[PDB]
Amino acid sequence: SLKIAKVEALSVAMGDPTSAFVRITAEDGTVGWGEASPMLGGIASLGVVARDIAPFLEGQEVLDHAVLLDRMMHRLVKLGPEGIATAALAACDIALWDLKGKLLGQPIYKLLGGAWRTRLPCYSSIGGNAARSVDEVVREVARRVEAEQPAAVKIRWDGDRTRCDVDIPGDIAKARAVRELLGPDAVIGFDANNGYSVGGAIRVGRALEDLGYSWFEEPVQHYHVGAMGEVAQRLDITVSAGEQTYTLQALKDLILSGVRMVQPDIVKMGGITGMMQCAALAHAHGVEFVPHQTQPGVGHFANIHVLSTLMHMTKPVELADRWDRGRPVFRNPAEPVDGHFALGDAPGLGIVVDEDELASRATEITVG
Amino acid sequence: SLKIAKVEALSVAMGDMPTSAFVRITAEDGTVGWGEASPMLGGIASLGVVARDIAPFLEGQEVLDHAVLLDRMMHRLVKLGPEGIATAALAACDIALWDLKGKLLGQPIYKLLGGAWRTRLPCYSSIGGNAARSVDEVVREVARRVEAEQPAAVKIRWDGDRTRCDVDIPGDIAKARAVRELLGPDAVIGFDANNGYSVGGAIRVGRALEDLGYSWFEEPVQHYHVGAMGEVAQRLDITVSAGEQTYTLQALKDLILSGVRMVQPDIVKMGGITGMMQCAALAHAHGVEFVPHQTQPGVGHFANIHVLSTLMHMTKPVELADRWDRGRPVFRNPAEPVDGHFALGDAPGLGIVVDEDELASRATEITVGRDQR
Amino acid sequence: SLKIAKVEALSVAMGDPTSAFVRITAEDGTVGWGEASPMLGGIASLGVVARDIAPFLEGQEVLDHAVLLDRMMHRLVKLGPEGIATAALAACDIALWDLKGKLLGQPIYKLLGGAWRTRLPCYSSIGGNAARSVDEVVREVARRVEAEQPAAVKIRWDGDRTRCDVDIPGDIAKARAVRELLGPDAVIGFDANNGYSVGGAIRVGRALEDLGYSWFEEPVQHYHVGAMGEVAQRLDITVSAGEQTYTLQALKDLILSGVRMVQPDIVKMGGITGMMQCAALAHAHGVEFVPHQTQPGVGHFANIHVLSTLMHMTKPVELADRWDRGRPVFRNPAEPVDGHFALGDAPGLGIVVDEDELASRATEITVG
Amino acid sequence: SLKIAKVEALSVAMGDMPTSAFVRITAEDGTVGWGEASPMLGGIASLGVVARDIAPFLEGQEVLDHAVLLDRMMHRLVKLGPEGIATAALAACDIALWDLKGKLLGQPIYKLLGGAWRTRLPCYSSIGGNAARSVDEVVREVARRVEAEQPAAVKIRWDGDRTRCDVDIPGDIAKARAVRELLGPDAVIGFDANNGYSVGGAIRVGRALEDLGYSWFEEPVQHYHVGAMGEVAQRLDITVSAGEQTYTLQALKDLILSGVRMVQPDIVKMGGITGMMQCAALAHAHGVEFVPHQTQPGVGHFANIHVLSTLMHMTKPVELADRWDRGRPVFRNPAEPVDGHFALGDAPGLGIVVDEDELASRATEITVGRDQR
Ligand SMILES: [Cl-]
Ligand SMILES: [Cl-]
Ligand SMILES: [Cl-]
Ligand SMILES: [Cl-]
Ligand SMILES: [Cl-]
Ligand SMILES: [Cl-]
Ligand SMILES: [Cl-]
Ligand SMILES: [Cl-]
Ligand SMILES: [Cl-]
Ligand SMILES: [Cl-]
Ligand SMILES: [Mg+2]
Ligand SMILES: [Mg+2]
Structure with a gap:
C-alpha cells in the first residue's frame, strides 16, 4: 500500500x-x-x-x-x-x-465518523488589549464584530508574563466598556493570558460575573495547574485552560485539578488523532471541549474537521487576529460567512495551496 | 456515498x-x-x-x-x-x-485505525466453571486447554452463583495452588472470582494469590460496588481488574477513579470498535492497563483483535474463552490459536468469513413484533 | 400458601x-x-x-x-x-x-408500617418547555395551576440531549416569566432534563437563585455523576437527580458525589421493596427523597403508598403531563382534589382496572 | 561591571x-x-x-x-x-x-552558594543497558565497574524500549537477584526501570526488590503518569524515585504532591545551578530526598557536584554513569573517582579545564540558519 x-x-x-x-x-x-x-x-x-x-x-x-x-x-x-x-x-x-x-x-470528518454540523459558528478572538486604551479596545471589537458577525466575542490581553496583576481596575473597565458596546445578550469571553495571581484572578472573575461574561480563559500562570483548577472551582464564571497543555496525561491532570472547559490546540499537540483522544477524555469527565486555534490555514481546517464531529459543542470556533494572512499562500483559508465557517467535502483537509505563492515564500528547513 | x-x-x-x-x-x-x-x-x-x-x-x-x-x-x-x-x-x-x-x-479495520503494532497477538486460555469442579477436575481441564492452545497465560474463572458470597475460600485457594503446581513457577496465571467475594474475602483470597505469584485478580467483589472494587485494588499488591460489567465511558472513568488499574470493557457489551478506542484513550490518559473481556469466537473476537493490534502498551494477552469450537460451522475462520497466537490477516473490514447456508439454517430473525423461524 | x-x-x-x-x-x-x-x-x-x-x-x-x-x-x-x-x-x-x-x-401502606399522611400534596410537573415560546410556557403553567391547585410547580425542558447549552438566556427568561405569573411566594422547581454543561448549569442555577426557585433538577447529563454532585455542592439552590439512577449502589454513589435530593422512580427500579430501601439510604445520609413519577395509574398508586410512609416529606408528589390518559383503562387514576391526592384503604394498591377497556387496548407480549 | x-x-x-x-x-x-x-x-x-x-x-x-x-x-x-x-x-x-x-x-561556585558540607563526594556506579543483556552479562559489567570505581552504591538501569511494557518481569528479577548475589548482603543497590512497567508490574517488581533489600526503585512507570508514579511510591516500601524527566519547579511540586519522596531533576535538563538550588529548597520544604540525575562526565558533572557539596542531608551518592571515559580528550579533568569519591577543588567558577585544540577540532557551531563545520 x-x-x-x-x-x-x-x-x-x-x-x-x-x-x-x-x-x-x-x-x-x-x-x-x-x-x-x-x-x-x-x-x-x-x-x-x-x-x-x-x-x-x-x-x-x-x-x-x-x-x-x-x-x-x-x-x-x-x-x-x-x-x-x-x-x-x-x-x-x-x-x-x-x-x-x-x-x-473522503473528507477527514467522514473518516472520523461523520459531522453533526458542517456550518460551524465562529467567535471573534481579539488580542493585544493589555496595551490598548479603553477606546481602542472598543474600536477594535466594534470593527471585528461588524466584519465577522460572530456568535461570541473573546477579548484577550497578551500582556508580559514576567508581570502580574498589572492593572486590574483598567482590565475591568475594558471588560465593562466591551459589555456596553455589545449589549446585554452578547456572549463575551475574557482571556487573561496568564496575567493574574490567584487572588487577582478571583477579583477579576467576580467583576466578569457582574458583567455576565461567559468564560474566563487562562487566569493564572499555566504552570500552576493546582491554582488553575482552584480558581475554576472557586468562581462561577467558567474558567478555561489547556492551550499550554501538550499531552493527554497533562490534560487529565488539568481536569482533575478542577478545570471544566479545556482548550488544547491541534497544531500544538496531538494533531487530528490526539485531539480526538482529548475529546474522548473530556467526554469521559463531563468537561467542555473548546480548542485553542489561532492559525487561518492548515490548522484551521484540521480544527474544523475535528469540531464537526463534536456532539456537545458549547462554544464557537476560534477566529483570531489577522486571519487575512491566510492569503495569498492559501486559496481558501478561514473566512467567515454569516458568522459561520462552511466545511466542505473535498478529500483530506480540503485546503488549497497556491503553488507559486508558497514557493516564493517558503524556506526549507533541512538537516544542518 | x-x-x-x-x-x-x-x-x-x-x-x-x-x-x-x-x-x-x-x-x-x-x-x-x-x-x-x-x-x-x-x-x-x-x-x-x-x-x-x-x-x-x-x-x-x-x-x-x-x-x-x-x-x-x-x-x-x-x-x-x-x-x-x-x-x-x-x-x-x-x-x-x-x-x-x-x-x-x-482496508482492514486496523489500517483504518492508524496501524497495527503487531499482527500476531498472544492468547491466554480463559477457563471457566471452576466453582463447581473438584480440584482434580480443575487441574485436568487446565492441562487439556494448555496442551491444545499453548497460551502465553492462563486464567481460571469461577462462574459461581452471585446470590452466594464467600462460599468456599479454602477450596478456592486449594484450586489456585494446584493450578500453580501444574503450570510451574514461571507461568503467568490470573484468577477470575466472577464477583464471588466480600471485601474481606477478596483481601484474604488476594493475599493467597500473591503467595502463589498470580498475576491478576479479576472481579473480586460484586460489580455494583465500585468503591469497594477500587478499595480492594488499592489494598492489594496483585493487580485487581474489573470493567467487564462496565458499559459507558463515564462509568469506566468512575471505575478508574475508584482505584482500579486494569480495566476490561467488552467490545460486544458496549462501544464497539469506536467506543473501545475511546476507552483505550481514557486508560492511556490515566495510566491504567487495558485488557478487554471477550468470550465470543467469531465477530466479537475479530473486532477485539483489530482494536488490540493498535494498542501500544499491550500488557496481557488476548482472551480465549471456553468452547471456542462453537465458532464453527457458522464461521469459516473463527478464533483458533496457532503457536499460541492469533494471526490477524489483511482482508478488508473485519476479515471474518461467514458460511451463508449454515447461518441461514441456524438463524432466527428478530423482527418488530416477533421471532421468525 | x-x-x-x-x-x-x-x-x-x-x-x-x-x-x-x-x-x-x-x-x-x-x-x-x-x-x-x-x-x-x-x-x-x-x-x-x-x-x-x-x-x-x-x-x-x-x-x-x-x-x-x-x-x-x-x-x-x-x-x-x-x-x-x-x-x-x-x-x-x-x-x-x-x-x-x-x-x-390490607392496603400496602399499612403493611409498610403505617402512613404519616393519607392526603398528599401534589406538584404540577409541566414538560416540553424547550420548544415553547415564553407566552406558551406561561399559558400552559397558568392552565394547569388553575385546574390542579398544586402545592408547587415544576417546569421541565425535555430538550434534545445531543445538544447542550442551547438557549440559556431564553431559558432564564421563561423561568422569570413563570415567577412573575405565580407570584413571589410560589414554590417553583426547574427541570433541565440534562440540558447544560457544568458552567452552563452554574449560570442557570445562579439565575434561578435570583428568582427564588426551590430546586434544580438534572442540570447536567446524568452519566456525569461527579459533575452532578459538583454542581450540587457549588450552588445554593437544591440540585436534584436520581430519575436515571437504577440501583441502590448507584444511588449511594450519587449521594456521595454531593447530591442532597434524590429522585429514583418506582417503575424504573426497585418497585415498592426497592424504593423503601432507597428511602432508608436517603435517611441514613440526610438527603431529601422526592421520587420521580410520571404515570397516572399503577405507578402513581405504588408511589403514593410509599410516600405516605415517608416521615420527612419535603416536596409534593409529582403530577406530570397528560395525566388524564389514566382513563379509561383505570377507573380511579391520579386526579387531584383541593391540590391533594387522597390515598384510600382498599387491599393492595387499591387501583381499579376497567376490564373491557383494558382488553380492548391490550397487546400481550409473549415469548417470540 | x-x-x-x-x-x-x-x-x-x-x-x-x-x-x-x-x-x-x-x-x-x-x-x-x-x-x-x-x-x-x-x-x-x-x-x-x-x-x-x-x-x-x-x-x-x-x-x-x-x-x-x-x-x-x-x-x-x-x-x-x-x-x-x-x-x-x-x-x-x-x-x-x-x-x-x-x-x-x-571564587569556586560552592563558596558563592554559601559553602560546602563536603568536598569529597561519594559516587554510585550507574550501569545502563541491562534490558538487552543476559544475566551473566549484567553480572560481568557490574563487577567490572565496581572493581574500577569502588562505589558507595550501584544502580542497574534497564534502558529498554518505551513502546513496550512489562516485557520480562521474571528475567528482570533474576538479574536483580544475581546482582545482589555478586555484591553481597550489605551493598547499597538501586534499580532503574527507565519507565518499563505498568502500575501492577511496578508493584510486582518492587516487592521482589524489597525481598532483595534494594535501596531505591527509579522511574518504575511512564513519566507522564504522575499520579501513578506517586501511587506506586506510596504503595511500596522501597523508595520510589522520579524527577529526571521533570523540567519545572512547579512540575517538581506536583511530583512531590503525588507521593514521590525522592526526586532527581537533572542540572543540564532544567534549571542549571540557580534552578537546582530552588529545587533543593522545595525538596527540603517537603521532606523529600534530593538525588539529582546526571549522566555527563564534564560540565554537567561539575555543576552537579558544586550544588551537591551544598546539600546538608545528602542521602545517596553522586551519579557516575556509563562511558565516563568520553570526558577525555575534550576536558582535561572530567569525572574520575578516587577511592570511590569525587574530589571537588577550589578553582574559581566550575573549575573544569577544557582542551581548546581538541574542542576546536571536534566542535560544530550551531548558528542562526545552519551548522558550521
Ligand atoms: Cl478511517
Ligand atoms: Cl499550583
Ligand atoms: Cl494550559
Ligand atoms: Cl462500593
Ligand atoms: Cl465491572
Ligand atoms: Cl463526572
Ligand atoms: Cl440520575
Ligand atoms: Cl553569590
Ligand atoms: Cl497518572
Ligand atoms: Cl520524571
Ligand atoms: Mg504536569
Ligand atoms: Mg456508576
Missing part, C-alpha cells in the same frame, strides 16, 4: 509573520499538509521534523500514522516532549491525515 | 452459550457488514432493540456517518439504561458499520 | 401513548398489577418479563417476593441491569405487593 | 552519547564560562534555541544579572514547552553564567 516518499519542513512568510508547515509527499505524488504552532516561528519544531522525524517516516506506510507517530513520540520523549516536539508530531499527524483522506477519497 | 439498505437482527444457534446475537447490515450496493451483541440470556433483548429502535433509524443513512448516527441513537435510547441491553445493541451496530466501512474503503 | 399461577406482560394503549403493565394472577384467581417505565413503550422490559422472569415466577409463593426477585436480579445482572431489566423487576415487585395486600386484606 | 560579549552553541564529538551540547559564553574581558545542555538526540534543538532565541538577548547584558535575564528568557520561551529542549537551553546558559561569575569574583 501507499508509502511516504518525502517529508519537508517549511518556514513560510504569510500575508501582504511566519508559519511552520509540513508537506508530506506519497510515492504516487499525492501531497498532505500539516502545521506546527509557529512559536518564535516554529523553527525549532521544523528542525525536529527535518532531523528526527522525517528520516523515520520516509518509506513507511501512510495509513500507519498512529503507530509511526506514537513510536516517534517515544523516541522524542526526552525532548520534553511538550511544546516543540508535540507540535512537530502534530504537524506530521495532520499531514498524514490529509494524505489519508486523499488516498481514501 | 454508500447508504445503508437493511439492518437485520439474528439469533443464531452455534456449534453442536448455545446461541449468539448478530447484526447483519447490508448496504445499497449489496455489501454486508457483521456485528455482534453480547449474548446474555441469548442477547434477545438487545436484538429486539436493534430491530425496533435502531434499524428504522439507520436504514437510508450513510455508512461513514457511524459515530454521529450511533451517538444520536445512544441519546434516543438513554432511558433504556442504557447499560447492558442497549449498549450491546449499539456495539453490534458499530462493529457492523466498521466492517462495511473497511469493505467500502478496501 | 398462595402460589403464582400466571404472569402476563401487557402493552396497553392509553387515553382517548402506550404503557407497560404486568398482571400477575394467583392460584386463587386474585390479581396484582405492576408497571414498568414505558420508555419507547416499555416493550423491551415487557419482553424481559415474558421471556426471563415469568417462567421462574410461575408456581412460586406470592409472599416470597424479595427472595424471588433478588434471585432474578442476579440472573439478569448481565442485561445491565439498569433501565430495561430494573423496570421489568420493578413491575413484578409492584404486582406481587398488590397481590400480597389482597391476600392479607 | 562585566558584560557578556558572545554566546556560542557547540555540538561536540566526544571521546573515541557520541556527541554533547555545550554553551560557551565569553565576557567583554575575554574570560569564558562553560555550560551544558542534556544531549538528547545530540541536544541540537536546544543548541538551536540558544543560538536563535537566547544568545541575541544575552549579548551586551551583565553576567551578574543571570537570574533576571534567564527568567525573562523562560517567559519569552514559554510557548516552546518549555519542558525539555527549552529548559535544557536555559540550564546550559545558567551554568555558563555561573562559571563566568565565579571567575569574575575569584
